[PDB]
Amino acid sequence: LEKMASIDVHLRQLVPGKVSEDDKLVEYDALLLDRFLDILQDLHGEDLRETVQELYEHSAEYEGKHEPKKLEELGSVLTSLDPGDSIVIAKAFSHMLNLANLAEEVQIAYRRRIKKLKKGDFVDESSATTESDLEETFKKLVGDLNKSPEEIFDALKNQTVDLVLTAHPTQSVRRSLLQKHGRIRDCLAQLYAKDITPDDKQELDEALQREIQAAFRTDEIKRTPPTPQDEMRAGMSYFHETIWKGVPKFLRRVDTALKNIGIEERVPYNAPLIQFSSWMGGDRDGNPRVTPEVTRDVCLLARMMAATMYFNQIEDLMFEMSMWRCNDELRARADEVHANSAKHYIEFWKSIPTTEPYRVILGDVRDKLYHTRERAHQLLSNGHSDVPVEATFINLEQFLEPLELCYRSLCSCGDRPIADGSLLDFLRQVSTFGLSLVRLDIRQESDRHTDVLDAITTHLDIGSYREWSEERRQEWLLSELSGKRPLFGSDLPKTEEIADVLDTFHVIAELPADSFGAYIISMATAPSDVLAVELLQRECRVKQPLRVVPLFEKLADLEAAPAAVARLFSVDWYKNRINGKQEVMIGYSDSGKDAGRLSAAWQLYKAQEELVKVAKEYGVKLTMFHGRGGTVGRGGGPTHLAILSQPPDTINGSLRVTVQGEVIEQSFSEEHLCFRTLQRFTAATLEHGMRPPISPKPEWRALLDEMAVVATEEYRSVVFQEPRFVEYFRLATPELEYGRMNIGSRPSKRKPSGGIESLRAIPWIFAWTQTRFHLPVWLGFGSAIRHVIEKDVRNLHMLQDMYQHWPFFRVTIDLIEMVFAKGDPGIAALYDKLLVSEELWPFGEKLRANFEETKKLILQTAGHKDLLEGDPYLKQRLRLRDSYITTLNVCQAYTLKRIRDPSYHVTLRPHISKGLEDTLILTMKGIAAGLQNTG
Amino acid sequence: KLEKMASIDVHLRQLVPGKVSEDDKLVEYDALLLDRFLDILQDLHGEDLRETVQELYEHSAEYEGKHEPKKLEELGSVLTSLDPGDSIVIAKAFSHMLNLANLAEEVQIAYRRRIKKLKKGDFVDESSATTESDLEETKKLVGDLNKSPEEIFDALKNQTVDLVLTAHPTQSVRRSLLQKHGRIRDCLAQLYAKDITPDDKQELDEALQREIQAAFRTDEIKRTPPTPQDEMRAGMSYFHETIWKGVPKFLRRVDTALKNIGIEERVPYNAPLIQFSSWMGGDRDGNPRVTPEVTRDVCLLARMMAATMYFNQIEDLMFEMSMWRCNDELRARADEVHANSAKHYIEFWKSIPTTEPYRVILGDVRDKLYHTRERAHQLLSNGHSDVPVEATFINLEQFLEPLELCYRSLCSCGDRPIADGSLLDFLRQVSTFGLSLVRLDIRQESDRHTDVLDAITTHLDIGSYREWSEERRQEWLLSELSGKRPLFGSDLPKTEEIADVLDTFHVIAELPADSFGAYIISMATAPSDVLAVELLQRECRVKQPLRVVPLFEKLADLEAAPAAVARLFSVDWYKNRINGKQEVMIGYSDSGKDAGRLSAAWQLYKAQEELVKVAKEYGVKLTMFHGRGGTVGRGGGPTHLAILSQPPDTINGSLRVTVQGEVIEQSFSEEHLCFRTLQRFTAATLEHGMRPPISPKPEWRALLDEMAVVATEEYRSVVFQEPRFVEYFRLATPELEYGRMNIGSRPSKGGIESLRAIPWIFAWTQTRFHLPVWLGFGSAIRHVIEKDVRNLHMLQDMYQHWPFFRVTIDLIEMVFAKGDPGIAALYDKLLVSEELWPFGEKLRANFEETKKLILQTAGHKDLLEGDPYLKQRLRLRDSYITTLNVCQAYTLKRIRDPSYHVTLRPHISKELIELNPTSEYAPGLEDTLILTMKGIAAGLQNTG
Ligand SMILES: [Cl-]
Ligand SMILES: [Cl-]
């Protein structure tokens, strides 16, 4: 059985050298592949195994030389498969790619950081191999920038990093597949431990094989496109995985780094340096499956999960807390708490004596936690309770109070060191996660509020709020918000939508405030959009209303935004309600859909500038919320510089970022990866506050203004002006199939009869990411760089200066370069050859030419001769995914030809040992998991 | 001025000079912990207190080095001059330091590397963990003995090792202080990882100090002398600690070794290679706090704990079990289970779909486990439930069936590798721990059954069951078991004791059979003692009666025992009821109390031989139960040879041994220690079954018979014939205080005969004298050397080639290492009348004489010449124990004698004096005595 010998050779040929000396990646991939193929042979036979192996080898050869004959060989083998074999080949390559991801994670987590590889400037911050850890970030602040330790500590207390978890654009993988990937991960890790006994290594190998098989033999589809509750259950797995234990870990690391620059204090245990907000169950923009009851469900479920974890933590806390010396205050509370009726610790002690006061108060807290979970479960499954809300914790201060009393008492008696053990960790978990783990954001279009108000104004015989000018709207809204009479009653004609909006507000009002983050207005354009939501919030009896966050999507909206926000601050009611804090959302991906990526990038930098001017004029603490698609939305290293790149004083101690679904596994599945994520967000925010990026030279801004004009011209002329574009888009791309399939819970368009305009941004990016072409990400960059080079050769020297010294520009170009690394025009041409009308082929040929030109221009701007010349580790990792993703591409393209065209009969082969829709879904989820994030 | 660290480094390095390997980091560990502890002591009670404590430790270490009595005089001088507050803090301090020494010991043993080049090639290698045979090396069977692997596999399938957890003779330390000891051990371990970053090392250092202080600031007294339920709760900590996870780990390792000798199968998941029995809540011998309700309590509690652990484990199982292809039988069972109402996993899935059949059956099992815990908690807390018995698992096969269905189904579809993961671990845990984790044994005196039958015969006007000869008793008991009429009713004059015995039988009758192991008759002497218990079991309507196990204590009982068992097998009713299985219990410590240690050891070897003869004559599978005090009761390595030492065919695939309380932490607190415990028990059993120790040469037998006669004579002449022995014992030893304080129960059942064996051993272990273990050996070896110049060469032959004799001598040698006559003399000087002084003097001479004689027999010039690692660890504990001894002796003089005024010193710094307010003796003297007792106890661990 010497077949294992071949795959080592093809792997070593795919990535030639070693990117370090702990570079064990090719070994890891070879081992996983060998064990997996042995499993495939043992489950489906020697013939199936030989076919799959020949396919992988061919794919490796293609990713080597990019010879199209290799692709035709792949096609020949794949078409000759009846759907039965097609499912097994597609499934198999999916799992193989997943294993490659696992090895990637292990390599990254245990790679040794090389201190002699730092150059000393900001470029070091674009890779995990050279980024500044927390303590290096401190020394930089204290050395170069002359900031005192006191100032660093004070800045830290007041800083908040808020990570927002979003429902996966496709597969938010089963809560069980995290677990299996974990076991494979850990087995791989220990097999290479330089301290392993032979029998331990044997049992580890058997566990590895057993779990690879365990993953290959579970189905990946069926049932419902899981209900929002199910997808939310999946999203919360990472709290069990790493974050719950990981947060006190990281915060204690902050304590140590502080001591090493002379600060004796710890970060206060009630300071919110870390926060988690979620969209799962709250985003309704173009997603009707998210009902008011869905939101109530994910809220109560969240409070349940939190109560369980606090409950199980407090028992180890209770064993720890066996001291007897205590405060007079704590002694009082213990003798008081002793006056009551101890059922949840009979296995531990018959009862708790008053000679163990901490155990008394903590056992009471354990009881209240129990009653909290039971009440939440009752309301979720029934609608009423019987658990008195007074027998539970209903707000965070009731919970923090006894714990803080313990900490005070322990410190009084000279027992602070015990306090900084399990007790401090526990307080830090309470303050970070609260009673809900996450705080749900709500999102809805502005137009739906227009509808609700139009029915309100029609029912009151005032006219139609939709016909009114923006100023008439503003005036009416102001008068009502200033007044004291309610607005409407049960007597109100409600369409299903209008009832949906009002009912959403009612459920928000029926739940504790600590469950909710922000109310987000999609397609916001004018101050009346924010005022609308504020009034609807008030007249629906929301006691403590949510902060309203406008989301400026289109480009014109972005130009009009700073006037709009200034106008909002100049109105007394909004100024008095916000309390000196205002949050605005920008959608890098959305704006990109409107006007191409380059113009959306430069416009967002400028718009953030003007917003900060306004927020300083009127004295509010502005917080920019970064939607899906940005530079700060990438995985790992690059985030560190993306954050540092943002315009000065747009962060101001409060960073709110979306952790895209495609990146969350890579960023939180493993102890080390999670630590370094929390670390680089915390450290980068802190540095950017005291060391803002350079301000751009005027010639740079003038140049980018030109390039923005040309780029939007090209992008809009191709995507919107070309009359035969959308026909091509529906042929050369699986957009229609994605819309009809059970992949995402969302409809792809806002009006089924509309063009590219009504198509949502997420399907736009996905459709072209499946074909390894990525047109939405780079289109426009070509004609911009071309235009300025022809106007004068010396502008290329200016662009290269910009790439070398202006962080913003470097991170924009870098993202593009990375997306090109995941691109292959050859595969796009194969989709063309099978799926596109012959008279439409030159269209594709021309666009691919545009591709190659833009790539050449991007490489020249970054001063590179190869893509990702600066990040060879990332280059290696992606080149290794390429070999599986390509097979999933060819399979997808022929499956499309077969699905769309029942007139394409193929000479099948005999079925291969112990249906086209399922194969297509597999190739989609696979390529999706392989390409991860682009734009 | 913090160069006190140089002082403790120098004293430590003098205490243990060399290296016993090169991964020998023990003195490093001890210095590091001690330094952090002393700094904490200074920051809590002041610089002066810290300097006092450090000076005391240095003096103690210098003493354990050169044994100069001046050092003892210095320690005493400082200790008498402390007011009770400072005496409490000094005593507590040294207790905690000794504990830290034990933790460092455990880490060093767990990570010491076994040296393959150090094996000598014979059985002596089996007396230390550093050279013993692992599972696979016990390959030995295949080489030397030419046994086929198939025969080894069959032997292993049928082998059962039954470890019995017993209540601690003193402090089975709070489930809370064990935990802190765990955090300290782990912190120590990770500080020495060769890949740890500087920030990691800083945070680990602070975590260690934090937990040392946290342990120092917990009280070690107060509350109740814990109820038997509390002691049982504490005893069950080790299942959560290591054993629950440890059993599937060990069994899988067995699987690997079997693969490594060519066997393709695994050990069947339902074969009981490991079992755990318990006495906590069932031994009532001289312990009236153990009531019927106590037994009902610990039974129900155990079933609760088991249900909780299965419940939490089965959720990881449910996530794992996401397969879809399955057996036809399993698909059926899944569709069947789908017809019902999914509450215990709303956080995981809204409900479980039928395309995940395994998850369906497993979710049902999770439901049934939940209801089992709730019903047990209800019965314990009320007396009734409302949980239908049909919704819980009441016997183990109900539980096993659906899991086995999953395993079968998974194997059907070629998913055996998935089956051999979390599912196999779960099946193995089910089979090993069952629904109770442990099985409770019950124990009671024979005389207490005699009372019950005597009141019965008096109530029926037949005579007094007490007056009847052993054969008249036998006769009546036989006719009654043959009969069909019940024996008694509510109309029966019951003393309080008799009500206790009958009520215990009724409670046994009310509980499931999986809860109970064996009924053990203390002071068994004759078959009528067993027949009484069988008859009481039947007439109290115990549906499935317990197996009855006689415990033959005294020497004459041991000679008479095989006659009794032969007569018992020769009775038709008993022969058919036992079903070919008989378990007999020996108490190495009890027999030791009767006739000296040597005579009890040899007599126990011979009596086991004769019992094997009887069991073959009548075809019964005999099972010997080793009570406390044995060679097989030691910690770690030595156990391996002790088991191998047993007489041929006395084990026969069924080993039952007592895990003494003082040893349990050393054997089960840490992952590796647990693995090697289970491994040496399993491997020793398997090997001894197929490779019996050599049979003894006839001259060795005759020689040991002689020595036993002399030794018993000396021992009894001192302990029972000297009229002033009992007077001395109450002066030179804290026996009266041990009984009068709060530890244990009742020591007397009169003189030393009515004194229980455990307080007998304890009293003389506190004063580092150990008279019960060695008394008699001196005069025996002296007698045989004078009888003939050559007998010493024969004894040395025995020590080198007869495993039994080697392990007896070896245990003695270890006990002497924990001995020090100087300290005993100090106890004399402070506590014993002057006209009694020569008595102790003469006794001490025997000690020294016996020591020299043991040394010559073992071919040694120093104690423990063969086990320098153990010598090092003991040498190191002794430096704390000695200070605790002096403190104890002066505290005794102060307690017994209110006319002993001492020039006290000014109180040091901030109090512990006021945690015992209702004390009849001085403010801090009671607690100080208790502290020294618990301390010295934890320092000397096991002797005899
Ligand atoms: Cl109880
Ligand atoms: Cl639900």
PDB file of C-alpha atoms in Angstrom, chain B residues 560-648:
ATOM      1  CA  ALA B 560      -9.387 -22.954  63.609  1.00  0.00           C
ATOM      2  CA  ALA B 561     -10.555 -21.157  60.459  1.00  0.00           C
ATOM      3  CA  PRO B 562     -10.038 -23.822  57.737  1.00  0.00           C
ATOM      4  CA  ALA B 563     -11.771 -26.403  59.929  1.00  0.00           C
ATOM      5  CA  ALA B 564     -14.698 -23.982  60.148  1.00  0.00           C
ATOM      6  CA  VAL B 565     -14.776 -23.383  56.400  1.00  0.00           C
ATOM      7  CA  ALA B 566     -14.566 -27.101  55.653  1.00  0.00           C
ATOM      8  CA  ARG B 567     -17.512 -27.770  58.000  1.00  0.00           C
ATOM      9  CA  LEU B 568     -19.363 -24.887  56.331  1.00  0.00           C
ATOM     10  CA  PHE B 569     -18.791 -26.273  52.829  1.00  0.00           C
ATOM     11  CA  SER B 570     -19.863 -29.686  54.161  1.00  0.00           C
ATOM     12  CA  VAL B 571     -23.370 -28.354  54.934  1.00  0.00           C
ATOM     13  CA  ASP B 572     -25.742 -29.039  52.074  1.00  0.00           C
ATOM     14  CA  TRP B 573     -27.817 -25.849  52.375  1.00  0.00           C
ATOM     15  CA  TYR B 574     -24.807 -23.541  52.576  1.00  0.00           C
ATOM     16  CA  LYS B 575     -22.978 -25.451  49.827  1.00  0.00           C
ATOM     17  CA  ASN B 576     -25.866 -24.892  47.440  1.00  0.00           C
ATOM     18  CA  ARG B 577     -26.561 -21.262  48.489  1.00  0.00           C
ATOM     19  CA  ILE B 578     -23.081 -19.774  47.996  1.00  0.00           C
ATOM     20  CA  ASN B 579     -23.084 -21.005  44.373  1.00  0.00           C
ATOM     21  CA  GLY B 580     -19.424 -22.024  44.341  1.00  0.00           C
ATOM     22  CA  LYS B 581     -17.969 -18.709  45.558  1.00  0.00           C
ATOM     23  CA  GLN B 582     -16.491 -17.993  48.991  1.00  0.00           C
ATOM     24  CA  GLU B 583     -14.738 -14.875  50.277  1.00  0.00           C
ATOM     25  CA  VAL B 584     -12.750 -14.900  53.522  1.00  0.00           C
ATOM     26  CA  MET B 585     -11.265 -11.819  55.171  1.00  0.00           C
ATOM     27  CA  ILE B 586      -7.899 -11.521  56.947  1.00  0.00           C
ATOM     28  CA  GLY B 587      -6.916  -8.509  59.049  1.00  0.00           C
ATOM     29  CA  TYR B 588      -3.142  -8.167  59.098  1.00  0.00           C
ATOM     30  CA  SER B 589      -3.403  -5.391  61.697  1.00  0.00           C
ATOM     31  CA  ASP B 590      -5.925  -7.206  63.977  1.00  0.00           C
ATOM     32  CA  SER B 591      -3.965 -10.488  64.116  1.00  0.00           C
ATOM     33  CA  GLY B 592      -0.893  -8.329  64.618  1.00  0.00           C
ATOM     34  CA  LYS B 593      -2.554  -6.842  67.712  1.00  0.00           C
ATOM     35  CA  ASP B 594      -3.229 -10.365  69.030  1.00  0.00           C
ATOM     36  CA  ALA B 595       0.122 -12.166  68.595  1.00  0.00           C
ATOM     37  CA  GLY B 596       2.850  -9.771  67.386  1.00  0.00           C
ATOM     38  CA  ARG B 597       3.520  -8.876  63.805  1.00  0.00           C
ATOM     39  CA  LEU B 598       5.801 -11.719  62.703  1.00  0.00           C
ATOM     40  CA  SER B 599       3.600 -14.526  63.984  1.00  0.00           C
ATOM     41  CA  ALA B 600       0.473 -12.995  62.428  1.00  0.00           C
ATOM     42  CA  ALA B 601       2.242 -12.678  59.051  1.00  0.00           C
ATOM     43  CA  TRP B 602       3.483 -16.277  58.896  1.00  0.00           C
ATOM     44  CA  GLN B 603       0.198 -17.611  60.298  1.00  0.00           C
ATOM     45  CA  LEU B 604      -1.758 -15.704  57.626  1.00  0.00           C
ATOM     46  CA  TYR B 605       0.401 -17.273  54.899  1.00  0.00           C
ATOM     47  CA  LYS B 606      -0.213 -20.776  56.268  1.00  0.00           C
ATOM     48  CA  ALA B 607      -3.945 -20.287  56.862  1.00  0.00           C
ATOM     49  CA  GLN B 608      -4.376 -19.060  53.285  1.00  0.00           C
ATOM     50  CA  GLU B 609      -2.536 -22.197  52.062  1.00  0.00           C
ATOM     51  CA  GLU B 610      -4.891 -24.503  54.006  1.00  0.00           C
ATOM     52  CA  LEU B 611      -7.980 -22.618  52.762  1.00  0.00           C
ATOM     53  CA  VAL B 612      -6.846 -23.149  49.155  1.00  0.00           C
ATOM     54  CA  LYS B 613      -6.553 -26.858  49.984  1.00  0.00           C
ATOM     55  CA  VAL B 614     -10.159 -26.894  51.255  1.00  0.00           C
ATOM     56  CA  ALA B 615     -11.460 -24.890  48.290  1.00  0.00           C
ATOM     57  CA  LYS B 616      -9.963 -27.401  45.866  1.00  0.00           C
ATOM     58  CA  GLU B 617     -11.213 -30.443  47.838  1.00  0.00           C
ATOM     59  CA  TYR B 618     -14.783 -29.116  47.592  1.00  0.00           C
ATOM     60  CA  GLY B 619     -14.433 -27.231  44.303  1.00  0.00           C
ATOM     61  CA  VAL B 620     -15.162 -23.657  45.449  1.00  0.00           C
ATOM     62  CA  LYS B 621     -13.629 -20.503  43.971  1.00  0.00           C
ATOM     63  CA  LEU B 622     -12.010 -18.917  47.011  1.00  0.00           C
ATOM     64  CA  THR B 623     -11.507 -15.120  47.158  1.00  0.00           C
ATOM     65  CA  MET B 624      -9.232 -13.667  49.839  1.00  0.00           C
ATOM     66  CA  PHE B 625     -10.062 -10.176  51.148  1.00  0.00           C
ATOM     67  CA  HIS B 626      -6.995  -8.317  52.461  1.00  0.00           C
ATOM     68  CA  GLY B 627      -7.970  -5.929  55.234  1.00  0.00           C
ATOM     69  CA  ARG B 628      -5.862  -3.019  56.399  1.00  0.00           C
ATOM     70  CA  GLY B 629      -2.258  -3.302  57.544  1.00  0.00           C
ATOM     71  CA  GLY B 630      -1.064  -5.777  54.932  1.00  0.00           C
ATOM     72  CA  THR B 631       1.882  -5.930  52.622  1.00  0.00           C
ATOM     73  CA  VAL B 632      -0.602  -5.280  49.785  1.00  0.00           C
ATOM     74  CA  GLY B 633      -1.822  -2.160  51.566  1.00  0.00           C
ATOM     75  CA  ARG B 634       1.275   0.004  50.920  1.00  0.00           C
ATOM     76  CA  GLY B 635       1.590   2.895  48.474  1.00  0.00           C
ATOM     77  CA  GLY B 636       2.905   2.489  44.973  1.00  0.00           C
ATOM     78  CA  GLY B 637       5.691   0.155  43.922  1.00  0.00           C
ATOM     79  CA  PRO B 638       5.842  -2.248  46.883  1.00  0.00           C
ATOM     80  CA  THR B 639       2.252  -3.359  46.261  1.00  0.00           C
ATOM     81  CA  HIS B 640       3.380  -4.994  42.994  1.00  0.00           C
ATOM     82  CA  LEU B 641       5.635  -7.453  44.780  1.00  0.00           C
ATOM     83  CA  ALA B 642       3.358  -7.974  47.784  1.00  0.00           C
ATOM     84  CA  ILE B 643       0.600  -9.303  45.512  1.00  0.00           C
ATOM     85  CA  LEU B 644       3.147 -11.469  43.683  1.00  0.00           C
ATOM     86  CA  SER B 645       4.257 -12.723  47.110  1.00  0.00           C
ATOM     87  CA  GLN B 646       0.924 -14.344  48.009  1.00  0.00           C
ATOM     88  CA  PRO B 647       0.816 -18.144  48.294  1.00  0.00           C
ATOM     89  CA  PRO B 648       0.127 -20.003  45.013  1.00  0.00           C
TER      90      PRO B 648
END
